[PDB]
Design a protein around this ligand. Structure first.
Ligand SMILES: *[C@@H]1O[C@H](CO)[C@@H](O[C@@H]2O[C@H](CO)[C@@H](O[C@@H]3O[C@H](CO[C@H]4O[C@H](CO[C@H]5O[C@H](CO)[C@@H](O)[C@H](O)[C@@H]5O)[C@@H](O)[C@H](O[C@H]5O[C@H](CO)[C@@H](O)[C@H](O)[C@@H]5O)[C@@H]4O)[C@@H](O)[C@H](O[C@H]4O[C@H](CO)[C@@H](O)[C@H](O)[C@@H]4O)[C@@H]3O)[C@H](O)[C@H]2NC(C)=O)[C@H](O)[C@H]1NC(C)=O
Ligand SMILES: *[C@@H]1O[C@H](CO)[C@@H](O[C@@H]2O[C@H](CO)[C@@H](O[C@@H]3O[C@H](CO[C@H]4O[C@H](CO)[C@@H](O)[C@H](O)[C@@H]4O)[C@@H](O)[C@H](O[C@H]4O[C@H](CO)[C@@H](O)[C@H](O)[C@@H]4O)[C@@H]3O)[C@H](O)[C@H]2NC(C)=O)[C@H](O)[C@H]1NC(C)=O
Ligand SMILES: *[C@@H]1O[C@H](CO)[C@@H](O[C@@H]2O[C@H](CO)[C@@H](O[C@@H]3O[C@H](CO[C@H]4O[C@H](CO)[C@@H](O)[C@H](O)[C@@H]4O)[C@@H](O)[C@H](O[C@H]4O[C@H](CO)[C@@H](O)[C@H](O)[C@@H]4O)[C@@H]3O)[C@H](O)[C@H]2NC(C)=O)[C@H](O)[C@H]1NC(C)=O
Lengths: 193, 208, 191, 177, 200, 176
């Protein structure tokens, strides 16, 4: 009934911002407790609480973790009152392949165009996908990325309006991956016309 | 013990003309007895014979599925089908499924081909964006020489709702040089109840 | 001519019972009590159709203790009083329809209220701890069960914006045999 | 008074009748009326043609007239419920049926058990009342015994309506447990 | 070169109970029928016609099963000629919600005598497939006596057509009742709805 | 393809245009400025204004070839109709029948309180041939209670080159 998940830091937050966070998610007052397997101190975590439209209550705790602490292999635990653990992914690494496409205009969509990005063949599954226009990152809510499925690959989708591509007809799909070289960034550009 | 009940795939419903629903029982720990999967219709009208299937998983968990043929007119005109799971366990489990309601919108199909990737010049990936369809049920096949490729050859994402109403899926197909040099045409075809005239929309993509 | 009893809602919840004399054809509706004790002022409404109605406030204690009120129309004579006999509290059952094709933002809630005696019954629907307007629902007039009780059905169309705000709707029957505050209720949720 | 055929007589029995309740019968098209059955309140029941009624034939009794209701059509939605066990009544259960959003208002409701139609007096159905939008609704109530549901725990509420498809019937089953 | 594949008329499907579909090629062409289910297909009737504009018209009329069509079967027509690639046309039962047609019939006033015009508005039906017949003295008039507009989508979801029937005074003096009748899969219960109209 | 000016533009507006559709140069020839507008197949349209008198004089324009069609003339007959109140009292469908006009070029408008309603308010069929001489068109207009309470009169108007006196024929219909 009451599910619990614990995610790893975003690759964009972990390698670029150097501000990694892990998130413990509880899906139906429950209490969440952070703890480290080493015993070292956990930082103060932010806790959020939101009632969903299906009557579900969702509790999310976001814990800041040390960048070196995460890469050194620390194991963090989330205790709900069921306990979850998260640690870095081991295993082989591989850079991602990025391809960006632009749809032709649908018979109706004369002033809106859809951009798609395929990122595939990367290891492990942890990846961040971003869309940029004029070197400024777009709001995350404007694009929708699938979770990685084993061949790992993700698809990203971004609808752009006529005002944007007429301002500049160039949109960058950027993948931030642990195995991406040389700046943990592999990106592609695409144009509407 | 968890139980799920699917709807017919648009392919089975509109192309194969053999729609089926599947009651999937995932038993976190197999016990001793034989779980009972009983089919019924909310109208009280008869159901057909179902196929039962049991398979123990590598995590020591038992999986029991029952597949029921449903009448094409019956399903389309809004019949509700019911899977009753008697296991042991405390109370009986009851799942039901019916056609999804709401506005209808045909899918838009866009088929792309990734340019050649260094380190593998015999592989090309084909991507298909299918979007702006309502409701969410959709089937995707990839055709070569007007013949349908096996389903395991392609992956399709689960439908997601767009900015407005409407859904989208991506379909990915890895092809080989032997296949595109034999003929450089590949059909991404989407099967959806709202497509006209025969519930299919398709687009041709070429590797070059 | 018809002469109704106070609704259990007005009598027990609002604590302001009234009775209504309806004549289906000026006329003279002289209100009186069988005891000869005074009656209050009444309202009067005459409506030409393609009928004269008059509503009299009555005392709560006066009604509960068995006073008989009379509507003489001039000659038509109708009287009303507290029904007497066996009392039985109402059974309350509330149901939600499943989602019907072509309208996923609408659900109908149904309430069966049965096996109560006497037949005087009121039904309220509550959502978000507060009473929905009476016009939101319809309720059948009491019909005799197979045994000696009565039953009504109450129907309430609800919207997705309401059950996503709070997925709980209460069907509340007001009846004199309900212990101890003259109400029985049952909650129904859409999912 | 002059009634229209019940949807059960019209579409299930296929012998529809109209009754003039207080007598000569006539059709607006001038065609003859069948043999009338007079019964002494005095009523006259006239058999009508099924195709004739559906085609909008106007029958008159004397003067009162009747014809099938015009306007839009809509199939009924059916939902069947069973009440939980009530304390002190372990061997009784009440079944309820909500039939709604149909147009026009003429509708026939039956309850079946083992595909055997229970007698009319076993149940009570309200008269059609208007919904909040367009369309009508009725409620049907059926008390059932322990012996009935222990023999087969399935009861069918069936609605007969002109606009229902394919055979002018929509039904729902309900079980006690 | 273009090809068209029609659905059965509601009249053939529901009144005649002999539904057929037509494959119409316009400019020696070959036409092949099949079913998406793979089930066999009956024998087709082939007809060619020379037109005034010098273009040939080849038609293939295929009888289809009544229960097969109603169950949602898909039928296919394939055309081949000297054209680059084969033309594929497919047809099946129309989907979506169903609504019976609403029929209303008008009689026009006399224009500034020997002839009067009757109009029939049939609207708010789904899907778009509809047949319109005119009756007089309980017998159907020849189809050539009237003309029916092609279905156009109304403001809501439904469709409408108009049907126009010229009548002579010798006809309404014999009897002054003319029946406009729509055949439609959603009409109940016998797939027909009708309205009578008089000149006076 | 090459289209002729609509009777509305020719008579009501007095600024006729022709459109060349390619699924491009204009010639008469005597002496106007052109306007161009851009399934997988691109469709291009170019709209050229023409002099009113010139098209009346029988001038032949080319992109194929178009000109004022010669032939017999016949004015349109107009009948306006209102459906009965449906069992939806805030909406009424209005119908109009235009018939027996030659040639087939015709324009149909609905007017309310002397203002032409937007074209998308009504749905008008293509000119179909009748049994005798002339064509016919049907026009359908859904109206609302707010419209007829302000003025319960709706004009169905046909613009046709053979209509007299001023190329218009109209009939008024009321809801109540
Ligand atoms: C009532 O409604 C509520 C909704 O209001 C619903 O609650 C949902 O419940 C489901 C299931 O219980 C939840 O789904 C789970 O969510 C887990 C957390 O998801 C977050 O984290 C994901 C992991 O992030 C890491 O990995 C990614 C990928 O590399 C990386 O980018 C990150 O930086 C990080 O490293 C993340 O992928 C995910 O983001 C995707 O999805 C969200 C949509 O939720 C979207 O906004 C994003 O843009 C992106 O597309 C998200 O940020 C998740 O880990 C978990 O996934 C595992 O399990 C599923 C099986 O369920 C597997 O299929 C999957 O492959 C993974 O193994 C799972 O998906 C969901 O989060 C709840 N929603 C909310 C808002 O709380 C209730 O269930 C409803 N009740 C009922 C009865 O139905
Ligand atoms: C031991 O190992 C076995 C084998 O993997 C695991 O069994 C799996 O359990 C999961 C979770 O119970 C099952 O996932 C569910 O599958 C349902 C069926 O989906 C199939 O069919 C549909 C259409 O017919 C396809 O689209 C799909 O790809 C599958 O082929 C889904 O309907 C379920 O989704 C619904 O429920 C979930 C949970 O609430 C929601 O998140 C979804 O959004 C949706 O509402 C669900 O995905 C899986 O099918 C099982 N596989 C097998 C082979 O049995 C055991 O779980 C595992 N044991 C342990 C303890 O880990
Ligand atoms: C030389 O002259 C001949 C004789 O007229 C022409 O043949 C016609 O060609 C046109 C196409 O150019 C055909 O038009 C199409 O007809 C299809 C068949 O319709 C049947 O069913 C309808 C009822 O729904 C009947 O009214 C009709 O008579 C037929 O029985 C229609 O399905 C088509 O309409 C739909 O599709 C098109 C798609 O482009 C849309 O534009 C339409 O609006 C509509 O959505 C279409 O109308 C016509 O049927 C042919 N008639 C005959 C007798 O053969 C030649 O075209 C002509 N050649 C040249 C070069 O001019």
């Amino acid at each position: 009934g009451v599910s619990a998940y614990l995610s790893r830091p975003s690759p964009f937050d972990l390698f670029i911002r150097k501000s990694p966070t892990i998130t413990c998610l509880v899906v139906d007052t429950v209490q969440l407790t952070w703890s480290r397997a080493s015993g070292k101190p956990v930082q103060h975590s932010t806790r959020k609480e939101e009632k969903q439209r299906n009557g579900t209550l969702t509790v999310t705790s976001t814990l800041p973790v040390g960048t070196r602490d995460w890469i050194e292999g620390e194991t963090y635990q989330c205790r709900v009152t069921l306990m979850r653990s998260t640690t870095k992914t081991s295993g082989p690494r591989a850079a991602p392949e990025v391809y960006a496409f632009a749809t032709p205009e649908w018979p109706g969509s004369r002033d809106k165009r859809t951009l798609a990005c395929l990122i595939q063949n990367f290891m492990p599954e942890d990846i961040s996908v971003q869309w940029l226009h004029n070197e400024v990152q777009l709001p995350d809510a404007r694009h929708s990325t699938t979770q990685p499925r084993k061949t790992f690959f993700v698809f990203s989708r971004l609808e752009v309006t006529r005002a944007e591509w007429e301002q500049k007809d160039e949109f960058i799909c950027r993948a931030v991956h642990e195995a991406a070289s040389p700046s943990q960034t592999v990106q592609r550009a695409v144009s509407v016309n």
